[PDB]
Design a protein around this ligand. Structure first.
Ligand SMILES: Nc1ncnc2c1ncn2[C@@H]1O[C@H](COP(=O)(O)OP(=O)(O)OP(=O)(O)O)[C@@H](O)[C@H]1O
Lengths: 280, 6, 285
């Protein structure tokens, strides 16, 4: 298996730990080996091995930001196939059932605001801007990939309604003021319950991290938990103007296509079908 | 993998 | 005492958390409150509250170092560092527990444990070269000369005549020591402040805590702490792997290691921990 193949590395990084006891979350680009208090990122393709140095450097930069919560901190890096040991953020995700409690929502939203605030502030820092990437015309490049790859798979009516969504992207300004997680899903935000009310342990999965528009992350929160909750976060954070709502609404439309676009490339039939549900 | 983006 | 007094503030910072089931460690300036996943530094005085802005900046710098392990991470805003005074400071709690001395009887545990100490101390040493870290952290001059004076002023009154004689012998060599300001020094790297995850396999270093006395200083200070706790053989192993087994370094450690008992006593005297003070003065009466 994957554990047997890397037993030499695991014996070094995790001395005495039985490899077959561990779990391996086979992600998209990396193969993270889940240990008790840490994980071990390994590149699947050769291209991922080339980016791992800067990825490791990026993760260290994120570790020195005041986000009001933990992030995977680099512990070790080398070769054998390059590797990166990151700290395991404790706590589990939060289901939408919990937000039905009003007092919980206040707390959860407030800590989300503190997180997004820290990300916003960090984007101003010159050091952070140099460390992290900031692609120009990511949406127009995205639109071209969608038009190339997904349009053939879509219906006539689906292409119309898709083109309207891609048309909206050109209206958006190319903002690069804040740090953007890029995939701020519910399962990527970990929480501490059973002590008091939920307390944000930390965020994980920063593979789509960049300097960009913070609406992207707000949209992700809205995709996870919905209208009423996002409104609460916007009102507390003071991001409830029309232009911000427009940017959020516009970006959220692409989430279905982004799922399909990725699934198309890595031959995921279940994801591709789900992403194209409306578009055919 | 997923509608949040992944 | 502290739990009851700051019940209202803690009820904000820790919503719905019962203060009855929270621990407290006494600090010189601050009063740390141990929750499950985080810690809250509470000023004893307004002077202590004025230091927290700078404290927050220091802990951020430590969180950015390559120590190969965790440190307490500021959970405040970034703009808290520019403030005049903070009523509190929240830090992330490092998971794991301390390690016993008897665990090191297994040689292969010592090899692993020492290697991770080396990774830490190597990280602190090379970070001390970085000029932004030097600018961030304090770097007092003639600290040894001053330390001896603080001991004679504060601790000698609590000591017997015999304890004072033995103290003088230990404090004598401090004036002769060179005032090194190279590495990032923890200042209290005792066994208790070094936490380990030992749930699977051999002990792995989780992280380090109590950076109240952190500074740019002599890396022999930290090595002395290790020597004080785990002893001769283990230290030498750490010195060998790290490559600090030279005669000069060994001599500095030997001198400081003798005074490390007094360092604990002086610390516990200032923060007012009677049991910790009794332990430190064990022998000095
Ligand atoms: N710091 C971490 N702590 C705990 N689990 C983690 C951590 N980082 C990643 N994971 C695990 O990885 C899963 C998500 O995949 P991961 O973030 O490793 O993706 P990847 O392969 O690096 O690339 P991509 O983000 O493009 O999918 C999480 O659900 C979790 O199980």
């Amino acid at each position: 298996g994957i554990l047997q193949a890397n037993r030499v590395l695991l014996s070094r990084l995790l001395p005495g730990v039985e490899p077959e006891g561990l779990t391996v979350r086979h992600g998209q680009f990396h193969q993270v080996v889940i240990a008790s208090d840490r994980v071990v990122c390994l590149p699947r393709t050769a291209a991922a091995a080339a980016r791992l140095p800067r990825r490791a450097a990026v993760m260290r930069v994120l570790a020195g930001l005041d986000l009001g919560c933990r992030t995977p901190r680099p512990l070790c890096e080398g070769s054998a196939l390059p590797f990166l040991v990151l700290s395991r953020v404790p706590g589990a995700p939060l289901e939408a059932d919990a937000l039905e409690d009003s007092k919980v929502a206040e707390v959860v939203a407030a800590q989300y605001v503190t997180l997004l605030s820290g990300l916003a502030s960090a984007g101003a820092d010159e050091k952070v801007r140099a460390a992290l990437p900031a692609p120009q015309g990511r949406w127009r490049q995205f639109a071209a990939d969608v038009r190339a790859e997904l349009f053939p798979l879509m219906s006539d009516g689906g292409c119309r309604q898709a083109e309207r969504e891609l048309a909206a992207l050109d209206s958006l300004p190319d903002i690069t003021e804040a740090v953007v997680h890029g995939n701020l899903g519910a399962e990527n935000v970990l929480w501490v319950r059973d002590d008091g009310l939920p307390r944000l342990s930390g965020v994980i999965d920063w593979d789509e991290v960049s300097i960009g528009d913070p609406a992207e992350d707000l949209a992700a929160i809205g995709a996870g938990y919905g209208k009423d909750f996002l409104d609460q976060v916007l009102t507390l954070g003071g991001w409830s103007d029309r232009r911000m709502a427009t940017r959020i609404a516009t970006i959220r439309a692409t989430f279905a296509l982004q799922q399909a676009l990725s699934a198309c490339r890595d031959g995921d039939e279940e994801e591709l079908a789900d992403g194209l549900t409306g578009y055919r | 993998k997923a509608x949040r983006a992944s």
